[PDB]
Structure formats: C-alpha cells, structure tokens
Amino acid sequence: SGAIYVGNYRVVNRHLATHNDWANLVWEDSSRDLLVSSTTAQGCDTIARCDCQTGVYYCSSRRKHYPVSFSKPSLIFVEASEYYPARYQSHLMLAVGHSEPGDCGGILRCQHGVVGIVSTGGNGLVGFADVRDLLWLDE
Numbered sequence: 001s002g003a004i005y006v007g008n009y010r011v012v013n014r015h016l017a018t019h020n021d022w023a024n025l026v027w028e029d030s031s032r033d034l035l036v037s038s039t040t041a042q043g044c045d046t047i048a049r050c051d052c053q054t055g056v057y058y059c060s061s062r063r064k065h066y067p068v069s070f071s072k073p074s075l076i077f078v079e080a081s082e083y084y085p086a087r088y089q090s091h092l093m094l095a096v097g098h099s100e101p102g103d104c105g106g107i108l109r110c111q112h113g114v115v116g117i118v119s120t121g122g123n124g125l126v127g128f129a130d131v132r133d134l135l136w137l138d139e
C-alpha cells in the first residue's frame with residue numbers, strides 16, 4: 001500500500017483505490033494502473049520533472065529502501081489478475097529488484113523528487129508506474 005500527496009491530490013494504484021478515492025475522482029487510467037483523487041488537506045510531496053533512470057524505492061516486504069537502475073517509461077506486458085485481464089500497461093518502468101504484491105504503492109524517488117509508485121513485480125523484477133509526465137499535479 002502507499003500514496004503520493006501533492007497539493008490537493010492523492011495518487012494511488014488504481015487497483016487499490018478506496019470507495020472515498022472513487023467518490024472524489026479527478027482522473028484514472030486502467031492502462032497505467034493510476035487513480036488520482038482530490039483531498040481536503042494540502043499535500044507536500046515534490047514530483048520529479050526529469051529523465052533520471054536511477055533512484056531509490058521503498059520495499060514494504062523488507063521494511064527497507066533499495067537503489068535501482070530502471071528503464072524509461074514504456075508499454076510492458078502484464079499478466080492477467082483479479083483487477084485486469086492480460087494487457088500492455090503503459091508508462092511503466094522496470095528494474096531488477098525484490099517485490100511482493102503488498103509492495104504496490106511504495107514510492108520511487110530520485111534527487112529531484114517523486115518519480116513513481118510500485119505497480120507490478122515478480123521473478124526478481126519490480127515495475128513502477130511513472131507520474132513525472134503528469135504536469136497538472138502541481139496546479
């Protein structure tokens with residue numbers, strides 16, 4: 001689990017969004033596994049606006065942060081699950097690293113700020129949904 005809080009927005013994995021997230025929906029995209037809802041309280045996370053391919057992510061299943069090299073956001077095949085059929089998930093960045101299902105929501109950060117959130121994994125890989133292209137998160 002996990003979310004990004006920036007301005008009056010909350011960014012979560014779309015498959016983990018709550019009833020409250022859907023009742024205050026701003027934008028959602030199944031192809032990206034992202035949902036943004038509106039908040040009452042002001043958020044203070046900074047979003048990275050860069051092309052970094054290295055950063056640090058939080059891994060809940062190990063209670064630890066790990067440094068990773070990751071691919072640029074792209075279309076990646078994701079196997080069927082209880083939330084989606086087999087599909088290409090867009091804006092996804094992959095890295096070699098540990099992840100388990102409950103790791104979704106962990107933040108990936110570079111020196112400029114928040115890059116994305118854990119969204120996929122398995123077989124020694126971890127995939128992050130990018131948020132750096134969502135320029136409207138700051139306005």
Ligand SMILES: C=Cc1ccccc1CS(=O)(=O)N1CCC[C@H](C(N)=O)C1
Nearest residue numbers: 075076077078079120121122123125127
């Ligand atoms: C293996 C799980 C997994 C983890 C994270 C993401 C996706 C998978 C499924 S994959 O491994 O088949 N694969 C990752 C590399 C790019 C492949 C492709 N798109 O042709 C899809």
Ligand SMILES: C=Cc1ccccc1CS(=O)(=O)N1CCC[C@H](C(N)=O)C1
Nearest residue numbers: 033081099100101103104119120121122
């Ligand atoms: C960090 C996740 C993870 C790690 C290791 C094993 C399994 C997972 C979960 S998953 O990658 O199979 N996943 C199920 C939920 C919806 C996700 C999506 N973005 O479509 C895909």
Ligand SMILES: [Zn+2]
Nearest residue numbers: 050052110112
């Ligand atoms: Zn950066």
